[PDB]
Design a protein around this ligand. Structure first.
Ligand SMILES: *[C@@H]1O[C@H](CO)[C@@H](O[C@@H]2O[C@H](CO)[C@@H](O[C@@H]3O[C@H](CO[C@H]4O[C@H](CO[C@H]5O[C@H](CO)[C@@H](O)[C@H](O)[C@@H]5O[C@H]5O[C@H](CO)[C@@H](O)[C@H](O)[C@@H]5O)[C@@H](O)[C@H](O[C@H]5O[C@H](CO)[C@@H](O)[C@H](O)[C@@H]5O)[C@@H]4O)[C@@H](O)[C@H](O[C@H]4O[C@H](CO)[C@@H](O)[C@H](O)[C@@H]4O[C@H]4O[C@H](CO)[C@@H](O)[C@H](O)[C@@H]4O)[C@@H]3O)[C@H](O)[C@H]2NC(C)=O)[C@H](O)[C@H]1NC(C)=O
Ligand SMILES: *[C@@H]1O[C@H](CO)[C@@H](O[C@@H]2O[C@H](CO)[C@@H](O[C@@H]3O[C@H](CO[C@H]4O[C@H](CO[C@H]5O[C@H](CO)[C@@H](O)[C@H](O)[C@@H]5O[C@H]5O[C@H](CO)[C@@H](O)[C@H](O)[C@@H]5O)[C@@H](O)[C@H](O[C@H]5O[C@H](CO)[C@@H](O)[C@H](O)[C@@H]5O)[C@@H]4O)[C@@H](O)[C@H](O[C@H]4O[C@H](CO)[C@@H](O)[C@H](O)[C@@H]4O[C@H]4O[C@H](CO)[C@@H](O)[C@H](O)[C@@H]4O)[C@@H]3O)[C@H](O)[C@H]2NC(C)=O)[C@H](O)[C@H]1NC(C)=O
Ligand SMILES: *[C@@H]1O[C@H](CO)[C@@H](O)[C@H](O)[C@H]1NC(C)=O
Ligand SMILES: *[C@@H]1O[C@H](CO)[C@@H](O)[C@H](O)[C@H]1NC(C)=O
Lengths: 196, 200, 62, 219, 157, 219
């Protein structure tokens, strides 16, 4: 018998995925995201659209999905399909098509303390206006804007990821496995939190 | 609101089944009257041989199970119901070029106390129209939208053309309907004739 | 001629290089999941994101 | 803890999303409509189609969806999915080849008084009379006609939220300049039904073309 | 009709549309596969593809959908939504896109003997190799392969 | 049918498709993976994308799906739908702009021992680097990296079915010739986790172009 069945049927019983997991009234959910570029597919200059394949890593804490390992023989990590849980509604806002969401709804890794690690892959078609003055000797500055589609700053706090104490203020690119585009060379890949 | 009580008596109490024809005996036919309104003509691409059009199909039939007495439920004389709760006639475009046989927006149906049901769903249709090129660029084309009922045979469902009234008299609507005030003409095609026909 | 050929934090293991090889390397890089160390024989060419080291001694690529 | 779970369970227990939010069937529900233009994606002058990225702001009251914060720990707002409650069927009447209604069923905001604010995104593809007499120095007047599809003005009333569309977050185009924009509400009566009005809000946008690509490439 | 509702309730009381109707363990089901061509639309030579509008004509027997018409006031046939009965997984195996299955899920016609006739419609895109030696004075030999994706010879004939 | 009916009702009664098929959480589930190439659809040298028609054969045991043929009239195999049981989340890591996972949920074969064989179809769009130095006389090496997305090699193990893909029913191309093909399984350890391996099978296809169209049309 996979103890994981007992455990998951204990967790998802009496669980409403429509309800934000705010512990108290003025509790903001710290949602930490990080981006990983897999391929730069194209940059259509006639439609001013950037196509990319990204793996976005999203972390947050759900106080309802915590347990004590001694009662479950030491299991400290479990995999639950994303469509059964409460998710922050992190979307790409500057899309040209109507694709706000991710492509593959992967499982979520849930730890005994309520930590949630979700790494869904996505195919996005962003909008970036082209500067044509120097075409074909030009360089372009194209942005990917991520927001919550449902919650405000009194509900969730979007932040960038911090590995080993130092923030990750850049797009992550695997130096060994990354295949260069064919027409475009990536010079800079910064990231920042903005406010309107 | 008394609509909640009416709609619950009609659908839940009376155990309404939406996969059964609206008839008292299995040997009768359901007459469905049909009309078509052209909202706008998008294109007639000569290389693909495809007419693209925006039309609003208009159904009308009778369901003896969707009847009530207005006096006993306040004085409700009209009701709106989602098409996924009542039986609806499935009329499909048979000469489409893509895999779109159905209407695009499944809007509500309206029901009156006698059981008369009306349904006007809008649709975008891409249909096969062979091009006569003999006189291009001074050609005129004859495109057709053929509609069939593939869920029941002619002994169970009868298709007809809808009727109007001028001075107490009935006449059938033998044409496509076009609002003369909200119609923007196409940049390349002007409509000359727009008949309608029930074919056996 | 004798190098370490284990990866990351695996228990230590060695290999004997081909005759005429005198070096030992140590590649380190990070992917989406973590850090990988590749130890072997020789001194190869690496892409401009990898921390490559080479040593001409013996078992000196850890 | 469990206060907002108890609240949503007690609000949707005996709710029916098929009936209009009215106390009596003779009254109507008032819906405040507003349009936010975000980007002008394209203008097809041949097929006569304008493509826009918009948000359709919609406000209305549901007097059965209300609670008392004191009995639910002080909650005054919640986020509910839009498929759980009654929604108005707003359709783009002058649609060309896109979607008539809303298809992104995004969550909505609900206050303890029953006031609802729903703001879903949409790609509008509208039909537009394109005049090409003065191309490439031509001005276009393009409209988006909106209305309730299955209800008349005695059951569901609509009213614009402001006299002019919202262009505060509008992305500059590159081919078109926005000169003026305004929304108007209309009442339409038919001879068959003396006192039944049919309502629609029509937003219009006056767009001037930037004539440089066509001066350098054709003239 | 009350008698039709009664008949449907009787038939689909324990009916499972996932199980193949084999009255005895070891029996095979006989499926008749026909095709009606409505329009040959295109034979694109740049992708080696052929688009056709067609009706499949399938017929089989389900011993579970039987009844005596005399006990139901003379009802001899029934039009039932296709998703409620068991159907063989007849698909186009040499399609060029990834669309194996049909498009329009018409109702099935079930007779009191258990004879099930299903005539669904589809816009199929099949792959055929083009012989490019006498183009444009060429003749092509394009095929449409139709078999059950799941069941094999030991299960259906 | 009657026996099978009862069997499927007794097999899906208390089954949960969310939990892995293992007797103890410390064991792993072994999945034998195999790839069948059926057609080479396209090679985009600009976007660097290869489109193929494949079959993803997958075998594994589910120890909760077993019965005793004597108690069900001798039945030894059935065809359950695939949405009814636990499945492995195999993803194409080097996907470019297609589907990451399987989307055609075809039926699977189940014998009385619990052994499962599932063989769904798929269109793979892989990101393949295109060296163009020798075009139109160029040879390409295109890969297809597959792995379990959310599990490590201690929970879900994969192993190739054969040393090289199955091209027995391969439709000849017209523009490309298959020279060689092989599959390799890799074990990856990270510095953080000392004894946790991450597995992947990578299939490669060495493709030689037929340079007749471009010699007669350009050269
Ligand atoms: C780009 O393209 C655009 C689209 O083509 C184009 O847009 C058009 O712009 C023009 C302006 O330039 C718009 O014209 C305006 O439209 C307004 C709205 O009209 C509708 O509503 C009227 C009001 O209806 C209420 O009141 C009636 C009684 O007065 C009742 O009978 C109604 O039942 C209704 O009552 C309800 O509300 C009452 C008060 O709210 C309330 O008491 C009552 O109980 C109930 O709740 C309708 O009368 C009107 O119907 C008329 O017009 C239609 C055709 O549109 C006819 O078919 C009808 O038969 C009928 O005649 C509409 O349904 C108008 O209000 C506004 O009119 C005022 O201004 C004009 C100027 O010419 C005057 O002639 C008119 O008398 C009005 O006078 C106003 O004067 C000043 C303000 O100027 C003010 O002091 C005074 O009090 C009064 O308000 C005007 O016509 C047009 O609608 C747009 N068309 C669209 C959107 O499609 C745009 O211009 C283009 N841009 C370019 C080219 O640059
Ligand atoms: C087109 O493009 C293609 C893609 O780019 C390209 O494909 C590449 O082809 C080459 C072949 O030409 C492939 O190279 C081979 O890969 C094999 C698999 O490598 C992986 O697995 C190894 C084995 O891992 C097990 O064993 C280890 C100990 O030996 C353990 O530490 C592991 O934990 C693991 O143990 C598990 O399995 C054991 C047995 O199964 C079991 O006992 C144990 O309990 C447990 O279950 C790994 O070692 C290896 O990792 C190395 O490489 C990576 C980088 O790739 C480094 O980061 C690591 O640090 C590490 O060094 C992989 O994960 C190899 O087995 C095979 O090696 C043999 O041959 C090479 C030849 O150079 C020898 O150097 C090597 O010693 C081996 O020799 C033995 O076999 C050969 C015959 O095969 C023979 O000489 C003799 O018998 C000898 O004993 C080889 O390297 C390459 O992987 C492909 N890349 C892909 C698919 O991405 C293709 O070539 C291109 N085509 C063209 C251009 O024409
Ligand atoms: C976890 O459960 C064990 C019983 O198996 C108990 O002894 C221990 O105190 C529990 N831990 C906490 C933090 O409650
Ligand atoms: C409708 O109900 C009223 C109230 O009882 C009754 O007087 C009237 O006769 C009814 N009408 C019909 C047609 O039954």
């Amino acid at each position: 018998e996979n103890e994981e069945g007992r455990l998951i049927e204990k967790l998802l019983g009496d669980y409403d995925k429509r309800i934000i997991p705010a512990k108290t009234l003025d509790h903001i959910i710290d949602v930490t995201l990080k981006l990983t570029l897999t391929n730069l597919i194209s940059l259509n200059e006639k439609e001013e659209a950037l196509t990319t394949n990204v793996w976005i890593e999203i972390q947050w804490n759900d106080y309802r999905l915590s347990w004590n390992t001694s009662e479950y023989e030491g299991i400290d990590l479990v995999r639950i399909p994303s469509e059964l849980l409460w998710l922050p509604d992190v979307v790409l806002e500057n899309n040209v098509d109507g694709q706000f969401e991710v492509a593959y709804y992967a499982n979520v890794l849930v730890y005994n303390d309520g930590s949630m690690y979700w790494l869904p892959p996505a195919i996005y078609r962003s909008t970036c206006p082209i500067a044509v003055t120097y075409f074909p000797f030009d360089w372009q500055n194209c942005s990917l804007v991520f927001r919550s589609q449902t919650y405000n700053a009194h509900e969730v706090n979007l932040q960038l990821s911090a590995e080993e104490g130092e923030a990750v203020e850049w797009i992550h690119i695997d130096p060994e496995d990354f295949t260069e585009n064919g027409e475009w060379t990536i010079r800079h890949r910064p990231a920042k939190k903005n406010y309107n | 609101n008394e609509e909640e009580r009416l709609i619950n008596d009609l659908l839940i109490v009376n155990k309404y089944n939406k996969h059964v024809r609206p008839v008292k005996h299995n040997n009768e036919v359901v007459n469905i009257a049909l009309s078509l309104t052209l909202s706008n003509l998008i294109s007639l691409k000569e290389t693909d041989e495809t007419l693209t059009s925006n039309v609003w199909m208009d159904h009308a039939w009778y369901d003896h199970r969707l009847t009530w007495n207005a006096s006993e439920y306040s004085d409700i004389s009209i009701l709106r119901l989602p098409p996924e709760l009542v039986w609806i006639p499935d009329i499909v475009l048979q000469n489409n070029n893509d895999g779109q046989y159905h209407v695009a927006y499944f809007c509500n149906v309206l029901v009156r106390p006698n059981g008369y049901v009306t349904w006007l769903p809008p649709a975008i249709f891409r249909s096969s129209c062979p091009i006569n090129v003999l006189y291009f660029p001074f050609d005129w084309q004859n495109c057709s939208l053929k509609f069939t009922a593939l869920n029941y045979d002619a002994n169970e469902i009868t298709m007809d053309l809808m009727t109007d009234t001028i001075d107490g008299k009935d006449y059938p609507i033998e044409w496509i309907i076009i609002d003369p005030e909200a119609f923007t003409e196409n940049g390349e095609w002007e409509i000359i004739h727009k008949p309608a026909k029930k074919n056996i | 001629r004798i190098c370490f050929n284990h990866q990351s934090s695996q228990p230590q293991t060695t290999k004997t290089c081909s005759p005429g090889e005198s070096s030992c390397y140590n590649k380190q890089w990070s992917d989406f999941r973590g850090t990988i160390i590749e130890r072997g024989c020789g001194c190869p060419t690496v892409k401009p994101g990898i921390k490559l080291s080479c040593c001409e001694s013996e078992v000196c690529n850890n | 803890s469990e206060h907002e779970t108890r609240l949503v369970a007690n609000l949707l227990e005996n709710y029916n999303k098929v009936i209009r939010p009215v106390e009596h069937h003779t009254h109507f529900v008032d819906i405040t409509v507003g349009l936010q233009l975000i980007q002008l994606i394209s203008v097809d002058e041949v097929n006569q189609i304008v493509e826009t990225n918009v948000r359709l702001r919609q406000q209305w009251i549901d007097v059965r969806l209300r609670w008392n914060p004191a009995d639910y720990g002080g909650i005054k707002k919640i986020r509910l999915p839009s498929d759980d409650v009654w929604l108005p069927d707003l359709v783009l009447y002058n649609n060309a080849d896109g979607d008539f209604a809303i298809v992104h069923m995004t969550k909505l905001l609900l206050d303890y008084t029953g006031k609802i604010m729903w703001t879903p995104p949409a790609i509008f593809k509208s039909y537009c009379e394109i005049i090409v007499t003065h191309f490439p120095f031509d001005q276009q007047n393009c409209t988006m006609k909106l209305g309730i599809w299955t209800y008349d003005g005695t059951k569901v009333s609509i009213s614009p939220e402001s006299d002019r569309p919202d262009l505060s977050t509008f992305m500059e185009s590159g081919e078109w300049v926005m000169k003026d924009y305004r929304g108007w509400k209309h009442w339409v009566y038919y001879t068959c039904c003396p006192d039944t009005p049919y309502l629609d809000i029509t937003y219009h946008f006056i767009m001037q073309r930037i004539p440089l690509y066509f001066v350098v490439n054709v003239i | 009709s009350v008698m039709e509702d009664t008949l449907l309730s009787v038939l689909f009381e324990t009916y499972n549309p996932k199980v193949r109707p084999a009255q005895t363990v070891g029996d095979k089901v006989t499926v008749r596969v026909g095709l009606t061509l409505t329009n040959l639309l295109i034979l694109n030579e740049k992708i080696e593809e052929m688009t056709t509008n067609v009706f499949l004509n399938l017929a089989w027997t389900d011993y579970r959908l039987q009844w005596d018409p005399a006990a139901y006031e003379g009802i001899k046939d029934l039009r039932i939504p296709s998703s409620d009965v068991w159907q063989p997984d007849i698909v186009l195996m040499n399609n060029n896109d990834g669309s194996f299955e049909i498009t329009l899920h018409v109702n099935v016609l079930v007779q009191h003997t258990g004879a099930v006739s299903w005539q669904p419609s589809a816009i199929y895109r099949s792959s055929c190799t083009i012989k490019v030696m006498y183009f444009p004075f060429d003749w092509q030999n394009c095929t449409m392969v139709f078999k059950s994706y799941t069941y094999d010879t030991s299960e259906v004939t």
